[PDB]
Write a protein that binds this ligand. Structure first.
Ligand SMILES: CCn1/c(=N/N=c2\sc3cc(S(=O)(=O)O)ccc3n2CC)sc2cc(S(=O)(=O)O)ccc21
Ligand SMILES: [Cu+]
Ligand SMILES: [Cu+]
Ligand SMILES: [Cu+]
Ligand SMILES: [Cu+]
Length: 502
């Protein structure tokens, strides 16, 4: 296996606009098949990249900056990863979703607003080529990726991901580490063949001969961990405070991260922006699509090599030699200047300041059935994607969603458009729920830890629990989605439409 910590961490370039004025910023991003070396000892890997880059370029905006991005498909007409034709027209369909984006519906990248090369064919919900992001939201770490119906796991695995950072200039005063000392970390697990080509499985192992070929799989666990498009890389840092925007851009894998010298992370931010108060943590779980905005203070570790480690298994216990490792920091870079950054305690106003009336309470179950080939089909509330819409909140109103998970594992549940608050989690009797539908608690409600006291948009719903969240649906109305962000689940078929009505 590949030797750890021999390639420098790439820092993706910030995308430059094609046109910019005070009224409007316009970008163009083209999806391209490209080859890049993922490790010193591999031949170049054929990938699909935004502007031919993996990850895609980092886009940086200000709060309320009036942004447009023409996302274009210039990919080949055939995929290179295995497509299962029985879970759902051109073969290659793409659509770009800005995850976390407070976005009008027709710029949100609905799964059925896909487009093939040069927009030759378009899905039935396509309206526009040039997406509009008015960015009328809290400063935060967002990220962009493909969201095409029934291909999301493949197109994302192929390399279609990037970071998108919204900067609110009212946050400048906190003096958090900035510029060179503010670094995104997009984490993606991959399996890589000897010839350097990506491996994505064609079928579960020990395929029942009942199975079609290719067959979707319910979960994907990569052998190797990349950050910013390199296998187990190293970052030289100066002995001072750094901010990192940590984004789990992996298909299935959840990470549980720590520093091997026992140092602390200082979490300043969640999916939806700055927490009200910074939190000192030794470790943290980060499931697909969650983001953690953290300060790491390398001040006291000059000269040290410090591994960002991982304790969470994927399909097994972590292997100390492989997936127990993420990346390595080397505190050997000389100070370019005095560390004037800060790690304040007092970051933002609490979400609990808000007093909204509860218009409605939805009860949603995570469940599934079995198809004609014997495979698990994962379903939100026992509905298929294609069934008539049932989650129909009214614009401007607040709902509590109770999410009941009687399955064996966690699902990271994600709602488009909004960020939301975490109210609490509560264990329940699974066997009883499965036998009779009746909901009996085995213990009291647990409120969120401080990490979850701010704004979230992707939230881990653990097994044998009920999770309650509270969201205000707005400011736009329209047609959006909600889904498990395990892409293998999402595509079959753990994704529903969500209509925010007027
Ligand atoms: C429940 C969702 N889910 C999986 N489902 N797939 C299943 S469950 C299952 C049971 C049987 S049985 O009934 O014959 O026993 C046969 C086939 C099955 N398959 C098909 C292969 S695999 C998975 C891994 C992780 S992890 O990777 O994050 O640890 C997380 C969540 C996951
Ligand atoms: Cu996403
Ligand atoms: Cu999203
Ligand atoms: Cu799931
Ligand atoms: Cu989504």
């Amino acid at each position: 296996t590949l030797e750890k910590f021999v390639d420098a961490l790439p820092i993706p370039d910030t995308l430059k606009p094609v046109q910019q004025s005070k009224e409007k910023t316009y970008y163009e991003v083209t999806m391209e098949e490209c080859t890049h070396q993922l490790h010193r000892d591999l031949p170049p890997t054929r990938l699909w990249g935004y502007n031919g880059l993996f990850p895609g370029p980092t886009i940086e905006v200000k709060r309320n900056e009036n942004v447009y991005v023409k996302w274009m498909n210039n990919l080949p007409s055939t995929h290179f990863l295995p497509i299962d034709h029985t879970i759902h027209e051109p073969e290659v369909k793409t659509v770009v979703h800005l995850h976390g984006g407070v976005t009008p519906d027709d710029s949100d990248g609905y799964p059925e607003a896909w487009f093939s090369k040069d927009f030759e064919q378009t899905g039935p919900y396509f309206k526009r080529e040039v997406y509009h992001y008015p960015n009328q939201q809290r400063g935060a770490i967002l990220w962009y990726h493909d969201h095409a119906m029934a291909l999301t796991r493949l197109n994302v695995y192929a390399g279609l991901v990037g970071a998108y950072i919204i900067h609110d200039p009212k946050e400048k005063r906190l003096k958090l580490p900035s510029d060179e000392y503010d670094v995104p970390l997009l984490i993606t697990d991959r399996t890589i063949n000897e010839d350097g080509s990506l491996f994505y499985p064609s079928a579960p192992e020990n395929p029942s001969p009942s199975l079609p070929n290719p067959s979707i799989v319910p979960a994907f666990c990569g052998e190797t961990i990349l950050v910013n498009g390199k296998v187990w890389p190293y970052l030289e840092v100066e002995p001072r405070k750094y901010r990192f925007r940590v984004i789990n851009a992996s298909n299935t894998r959840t990470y549980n991260l720590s520093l091997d010298n026992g140092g602390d992370f200082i979490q300043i931010g969640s999916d939806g922006g700055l927490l009200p108060r910074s939190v000192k943590l030794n470790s943290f779980s980060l499931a697909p699509a969650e983001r953690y905005d953290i300060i790491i203070d390398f001040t006291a570790y000059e000269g040290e090599s410090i591994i960002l480690a991982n304790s969470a298994g994927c399909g097994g216990d972590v292997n100390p030699e492989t997936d127990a490792n993420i990346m390595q920091f080397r505190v050997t870079k000389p100070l370019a200047q005095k560390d004037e950054s800060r790690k304040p305690k007092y970051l933002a106003s609490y979400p609990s300041v808000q007093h909204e009336r509860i218009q409605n309470i939805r009860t949603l179950k995570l469940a599934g059935t079995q198809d004609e080939y014997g495979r698990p089909v994962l379903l939100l509330n026992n509905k298929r994607w294609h069934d008539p819409v049932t989650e129909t909140p009214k614009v401007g109103t607040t709902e509590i969603w109770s999410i009941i998970n009687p399955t064996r594992g966690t699902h990271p549940i994600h709602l488009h458009l909004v960020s939301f608050r975490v109210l609490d989690r509560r264990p329940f009797d699974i066997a009883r729920y499965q036998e009779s539908g009746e909901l009996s608690y085995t213990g009291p409600a647990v409120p969120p830890p401080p990490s979850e006291k701010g704004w979230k948009d992707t939230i881990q719903a653990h097994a044998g629990e009920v999770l309650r969240i509270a969201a205000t649906f707005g400011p736009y109305s329209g047609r959006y989605v909600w889904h498990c962000h395990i892409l293998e689940h999402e595509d079959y078929d753990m994704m529903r439409p969500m209509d925010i009505t007027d």
